[PDB]
Each structure stands twice: as C-alpha cells, then as structure tokens.
Amino acid sequence: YNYGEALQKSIMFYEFQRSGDLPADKRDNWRDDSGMKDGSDVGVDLTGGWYDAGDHVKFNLPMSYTSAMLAWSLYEDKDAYDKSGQTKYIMDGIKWANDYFIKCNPTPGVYYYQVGDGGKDHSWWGPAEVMQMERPSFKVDASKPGSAVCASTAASLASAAVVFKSSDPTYAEKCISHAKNLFDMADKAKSDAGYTAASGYYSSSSFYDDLSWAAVWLYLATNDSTYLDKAESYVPNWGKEQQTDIIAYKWGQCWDDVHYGAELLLAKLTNKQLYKDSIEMNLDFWTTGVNGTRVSYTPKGLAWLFQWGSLRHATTQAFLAGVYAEWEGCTPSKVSVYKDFLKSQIDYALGSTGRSFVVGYGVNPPQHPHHRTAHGSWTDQMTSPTYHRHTIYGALVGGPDNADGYTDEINNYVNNEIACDYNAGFTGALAKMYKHSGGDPIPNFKAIEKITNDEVIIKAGLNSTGPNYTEIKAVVYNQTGWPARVTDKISFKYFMDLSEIVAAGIDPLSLVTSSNYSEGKNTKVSGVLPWDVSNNVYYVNVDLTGENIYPGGQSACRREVQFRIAAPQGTTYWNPKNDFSYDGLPTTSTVNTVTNIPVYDNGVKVFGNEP
Numbered sequence: 271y272n273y274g275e276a277l278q279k280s281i282m283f284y285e286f287q288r289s290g291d292l293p294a295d296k297r298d299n300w301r302d303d304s305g306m307k308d309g310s311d312v313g314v315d316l317t318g319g320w321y322d323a324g325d326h327v328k329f330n331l332p333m334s335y336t337s338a339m340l341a342w343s344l345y346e347d348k349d350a351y352d353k354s355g356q357t358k359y360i361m362d363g364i365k366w367a368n369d370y371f372i373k374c375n376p377t378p379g380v381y382y383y384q385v386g387d388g389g390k391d392h393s394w395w396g397p398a399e400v401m402q403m404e405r406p407s408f409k410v411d412a413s414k415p416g417s418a419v420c421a422s423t424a425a426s427l428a429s430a431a432v433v434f435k436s437s438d439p440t441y442a443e444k445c446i447s448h449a450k451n452l453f454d455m456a457d458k459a460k461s462d463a464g465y466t467a468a469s470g471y472y473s474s475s476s477f478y479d480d481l482s483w484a485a486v487w488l489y490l491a492t493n494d495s496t497y498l499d500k501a502e503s504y505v506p507n508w509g510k511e512q513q514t515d516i517i518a519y520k521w522g523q524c525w526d527d528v529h530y531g532a533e534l535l536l537a538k539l540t541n542k543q544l545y546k547d548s549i550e551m552n553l554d555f556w557t558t559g560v561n562g563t564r565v566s567y568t569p570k571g572l573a574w575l576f577q578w579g580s581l582r583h584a585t586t587q588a589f590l591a592g593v594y595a596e597w598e599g600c601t602p603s604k605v606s607v608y609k610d611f612l613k614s615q616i617d618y619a620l621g622s623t624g625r626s627f628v629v630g631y632g633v634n635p636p637q638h639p640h641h642r643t644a645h646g647s648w649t650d651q652m653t654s655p656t657y658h659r660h661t662i663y664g665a666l667v668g669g670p671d672n673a674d675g676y677t678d679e680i681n682n683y684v685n686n687e688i689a690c691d692y693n694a695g696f697t698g699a700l701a702k703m704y705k706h707s708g709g710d711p712i713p714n715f716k717a718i719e720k721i722t723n724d725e726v727i728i729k730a731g732l733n734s735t736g737p738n739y740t741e742i743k744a745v746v747y748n749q750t751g752w753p754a755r756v757t758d759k760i761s762f763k764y765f766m767d768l769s770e771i772v773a774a775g776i777d778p779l780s781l782v783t784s785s786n787y788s789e790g791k792n793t794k795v796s797g798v799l800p801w802d803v804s805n806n807v808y809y810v811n812v813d814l815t816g817e818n819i820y821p822g823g824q825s826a827c828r829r830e831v832q833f834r835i836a837a838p839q840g841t842t843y844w845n846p847k848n849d850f851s852y853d854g855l856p857t858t859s860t861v862n863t864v865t866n867i868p869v870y871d872n873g874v875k876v877f878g879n880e881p
C-alpha cells in the first residue's frame with residue numbers, strides 16, 4: 271500500500287475539522303470560517319481548534335488527546351515527516367489545536383474545556399459555516415475541577431513544545447507556560463467533578479493516567495525532574511485489572527485512557543522493569559496473547575477491542591507497538607511480533623480485506639461517513655443529497671464489527687463515524703509504515719473540488735394568469751457548498767418584451783407590479799424597469815438582500831416570492847409569449863427549475879441567462 275499518501279491524507283483530515291478563522295493558505299475550497307463567535311458568551315476569544323467528529327462541538331479532552339498523539343508521532347519519527355514532505359502540514363495541525371488550548375487558558379487557574387452543547391449541536395444536520403444554534407462555553411477552575419481534561423491539554427501543549435522547540439523556541443516556551451498552569455490545576459484538584467458539559471459524549475473515567483501522561487511530557491519539555499517524579503508517583507493510582515494488583519493491560523491507548531502511552535514513555539525514560547512489563551503485557555495481550563488472555567481478532571485479521579471505533583483502537587495500538595518495538599529495551603523476540611502487528615493492522619485499515627476504510631484513499635473507500643460538513647446537506651436532512659458533496663480525505667471510519675461486518679451508511683455512527691481521535695494514533699502508525707515501506711505522497715496535493723451542483727438556483731411556475739396579466743410563483747434555493755454560506759445579497763430578474771404595451775399607447779413603466787405572497791420579510795418586488803428598450807425589454811427586479819438564506823433547512827435555504835405584472839383591466843393586448851422569462855415557464859403553481867429568470871449574487875449573475 272502507498273503509506274506516504276495515506277500519511278499525507280490522514281494529516282489533511284484535520285484541516286477539514288478546523289473551526290474558526292481559516293488560513294488564507296488553505297488547500298480546499300469547501301471549508302470556511304465557522305464558530306466565529308465561539309467564546310462570545312464569556313467574553314473570551316475561543317475561536318479555532320478542531321470539531322470533534324461528524325459534529326461541531328469542540329470537546330477538549332479528545333481534541334488534546336489527538337494533538338498530543340500527533341506531536342508524539344513527530345517526536346518519534348521526524349525523519350519520516352521530512353522525507354515525505356509532510357512536516358509543515360502536521361506541525362500546522364499541532365499548532366492549530368494548541369493555539370486554541372492557549373486561548374482556552376486566558377488567565378492563570380481558568381480553563382475553558384468545551385465550546386458547544388452536544389444536545390443542541392447534534393439536533394441539526396448541516397455545514398459548520400452556517401450553524402445557527404447557541405454554542406455555550408464551559409470552564410473548570412479551582413472550585414469546579416477537570417483534572418483529566420486539564421492534564422490532557424497540558425500533555426498536548428508540552429508535547430507540542432518538544433517538537434516545536436528547534437524551529438520556534440518562543441512558541442515552545444509559550445506552550446510550556448500554559449501546560450504548567452493547566453497541569454498545576456489538574457494536580458492540585460485530582461478530580462473530574464467539575465468536568466460535566468461533555469456528559470454522554472466524553473465523560474472521564476480516569477485522571478491519574480492523564481496526570482502521568484502530562485507529567486511525562488512536561489518532563490520532556492522542561493527537563494525538570496520534578497515532573498518525572500510526579501509521573502511515577504501516580505502509577506499506584508492507575509486502574510488495575512480486576513481482582514489483580516496488576517496495572518490494567520486489556521484495553522488500549524485512547525482519549526479516556528492514556529496510561530498505555532505514559533508507561534511506554536516511562537519505560538524508555540527510566541528503563542524500570544515495572545513499565546517495561548506493563549507495556550509488554552498490553553502489547554502481548556494484543557498480539558500473541560498473555561496469561562491465557564488475548565484481544566479478539568476478526569476472521570480477516572483485525573485486532574478487535576470494542577464495537578465503537580474498532581479501527582481507531584487497533585491502529586492506535588499499532589502505533590504504540592511500532593514505537594516500543596524500535597526501542598532497544600524491547601524484549602528482542604517480540605520486536606518482529608510487534609512490527610508484524612503494526613503492519614497487519616494498518617494494512618487492514620488500508621485495504622487488506624479488499625477495500626479501504628480511509629475516505630478518499632485506496633480501493634472502494636467509504637462514501638458515506640457520518641459527517642455533517644463533508645455530506646453538505648442544505649435541508650437539515652441526513653438523507654439529502656443521497657451522496658456526500660465533499661471528500662474528507664484521510665478520515666479513518668469507525669470500523670467493522672467482530673465478524674468484519676461493515677455497512678457504509680451515513681446513519682451508522684457506531685461503525686461509520688469519523689473523528690479526531692480516530693486518526694490520531696493512526697497517523698503515527700502510518701508514519702512508521704512509510705519509513706519502512708514507502709509509497710510516495712501525491713505532490714502538491716490539494717482538495718479544490720469541482721462544484722457539482724448549482725449553488726443558487728431558482729424554480730418558477732405560472733401562479734395566476736389573465737388577458738391583462740401574468741402572475742409568477744418563484745422560489746430561490748441556496749444549495750451552496752463551496753463553501754456552504756449564507757446568501758444575503760441575492761436577487762433575480764423577470765424579463766418581458768413590452769412592445770405590445772408601447773403599441774397600445776401605454777407607458778411600460780406604468781404597468782402595475784404586485785405580490786400577494788412571499789417568504790422573507792425583506793423580499794422587495796420592483797415596478798417595471800427598463801433593460802433594453804431598443805428591443806422593448808423591461809424587467810421586474812426582485813431583491814432578497816438582507817434575507818438570512820442559508821443551506822441548513824427546508825425553509826432556511828429557500829425564499830418563495832409571488833409577483834404579478836398587469837396591464838389595465840379590460841385590455842387584451844398583454845402578450846406573455848414574447849417575454850423572455852415566460853418561455854418554457856411551468857403552466858401551473860407547481861414550480862420547476864428555470865434558466866430564464868436569472869439569479870444574481872451581489873449584482874453578479876450566478877444562475878440562468880439574460881435576454
């Protein structure tokens with residue numbers, strides 16, 4: 271498999287998750303500014319960071335877990351990133367998350383750990399750029415603690431400091447300053463009691479693991495052994511295997527449990543047997559098995575841990591196995607076992623079963639990941655359109671069940687959602703496979719997509735008619751996607767040939783235009799205006815400027831306008847047949863897309879034709 275391309279796309283995945291004011295240097299044409307008022311409720315700029323999964327909540331625990339894991343990869347395999355030419359991209363990602371965590375620590379002792387409400391956010395299915403719901407900010411402090419999330423963020427900031435120190439020593443120091451404050455908060459409190467806004471999504475079941483993980487990274491960033499001593503001091507407090515006094519080993523590294531990564535690092539830093547034994551017990555359980563126990567394996571080779579995000583778990587363990595196998599302290603006989611495991615799990619994700627589980631990569635990749643912005647519905651419907659308008663490159667889907675079963679459907683969020691933490695360890699494992707087996711990334715890769723549907727259209731039909739008038743029912747639709755956006759400067763024009771009016775000795779400008787119905791309070795229908803009088807062409811201008819038309823609902827994306835143009839009552843010379851906009855017009859109140867009632871966006875024609 272082409273591991274370099276996979277690595278390249280896995281890193282790119284995060285760029286599509288970005289919230290906030292996006293860079294001018296962005297390499298896609300379908301994501302734009304969003305969550306621009308994040309933090310406005312507390313008077314703090316909390317814009318930026320990454321949306322968690324297929325949704326738009328910013329959950330700092332998995333977000334910081336993710337950036338800490340990406341930095342860990344860059345720390346372990348900078349040469350792989352340099353050789354593949356992806357170094358700039360992963361560093362930009364790491365900085366994107368950490369710049370946001372810094373904003374979340376506005377003053378010593380205060381940490382905002384979330385922006386958005388799961389309940390409200392998930393109740394709407396649409397693109398990030400046009401979210402209309404409230405996005406509350408939540409914080410922890412001395413009176414309401416969040417040890418896991420504060421320490422997880424400290425680990426992200428400290429690991430970022432380690433990998434940025436050589437090229438940007440000042441940013442490294444900035445990261446360390448904030449990591450120290452957040453760790454102090456976490457260490458002083460030793461409680462997750464104030465971390466409640468993520469209930470039902472990312473509630474924490476442990477924080478001593480996060481304390482050790484953060485302390486290890488702060489040790490590597492500052493070289494102050496005060497932190498190494500702390501890291502080791504929490505070990506007795508880590509969860510144990512049931513009815514044993516053995517450090518847990520039957521799960522895997524993940525957003526809720528980072529003792530696996532902490533013990534791996536502590537083994538390399540101290541060479542103490544306790545840590546070596548602990549990480550090898552975990553890696554053994556995942557490979558050969560240990561003490562009669564072994565993680566389940568699917569018939570096709572996937573180490574299967576749990577129903578949700580099976581690939582996320584397997585590929586993360588693959589990364590840890592790769593890191594540990596390269597360490598001189600690893601039991602020699604297990605080096606090959608662990609490396610074989612890294613390859614088998616990554617290959618399963620990339621295509622060993624005959625298809626890829628990575629969006630926009632390989633053979634028969636997933637087409638319907640549970641992701642709002644990549645899908646791009648403009649009607650608040652998971653079912654419409656019936657295909658994803660965008661390709662969210664690099665995203666690793668949840669994964670199959672214990673029997674390799676997998677259904678690529680948008681509503682399957684258990685096995686087909688995509689998320690920050692899903693790609694975290696995966697990215698690191700990919701860097702290792704690239705280093706070993708290669709595969710050239712795509713040069714100058716970008717995600718500038720072809721526009722696949724007219725972004726703003728109009729449908730019309732004959733509402734009412736008479737010997738002296740024509741009444742039109744028109745509906746404008748915002749189907750924007752590159753990027754999805756509010757269209758508050760839309761207008762359209764209805765063209766007529768009024769030669770018969772001039773011939774009747776009547777002023778075309780005196781005809782009466784009117785509207786008996788229209789959605790939108792700003793809808794304005796003009797009187798008859800001249801367009802090309804040499805050919806007796808006049809028009810009615812319908813301005814929708816000011817209307818908050820956006821691709822996020824059946825009513826939200828459309829504006830209906832009914833308007834009539836009429837010659838004097840009792841007259842019979844009105845002739846709609848020579849009117850440009852009347853040609854082909856649906857003969858009734860049931861509208862259809864028309865191309866002769868042009869739509870304009872800030873005066874620029876974007877749909878339809880003029881006379």
Ligand SMILES: OC[C@H]1O[C@@H](O[C@H]2[C@H](O)[C@@H](O)[C@H](O[C@H]3[C@H](O)[C@@H](O)[C@H](O)O[C@@H]3CO)O[C@@H]2CO)[C@H](O)[C@@H](O)[C@@H]1O
Nearest residue numbers: 471475476509518520521522524525526527578579691
């Ligand atoms: O031995 C059990 C292990 O449990 C781990 O916690 C897991 C929770 O039990 C599980 O409910 C939760 O599932 C999440 C999933 O992680 C998340 O990514 C997905 O989006 O939603 C699911 C809930 O609907 O996962 C956590 C973490 O794996 C402990 O962390 C671990 O120590 C313990 O051994």
Ligand SMILES: OC[C@H]1O[C@@H](O[C@H]2[C@H](O)[C@@H](O)[C@H](O)O[C@@H]2CO)[C@H](O)[C@@H](O)[C@@H]1O
Nearest residue numbers: 323324325392393470640652681683687
């Ligand atoms: O929490 C699981 C999953 O929920 C997704 O939102 C669901 C919501 O949970 C359900 O009550 C509603 O009926 O449908 C929506 C859309 O499927 C959410 O999109 C995922 O991010 C989340 O993992």
Ligand SMILES: [Ca+2]
Nearest residue numbers: 476477526527
């Ligand atoms: Ca934890």
Ligand SMILES: [Ca+2]
Nearest residue numbers: 767845846849
């Ligand atoms: Ca006419």
Ligand SMILES: [Mg+2]
Nearest residue numbers: 291292293294
């Ligand atoms: Mg900008």
Ligand SMILES: [Mg+2]
Nearest residue numbers: 323471683687
């Ligand atoms: Mg979820």
Ligand SMILES: [Mg+2]
Nearest residue numbers: 637638656657
């Ligand atoms: Mg399909």
Ligand SMILES: [Mg+2]
Nearest residue numbers: 767805806848
């Ligand atoms: Mg004519």
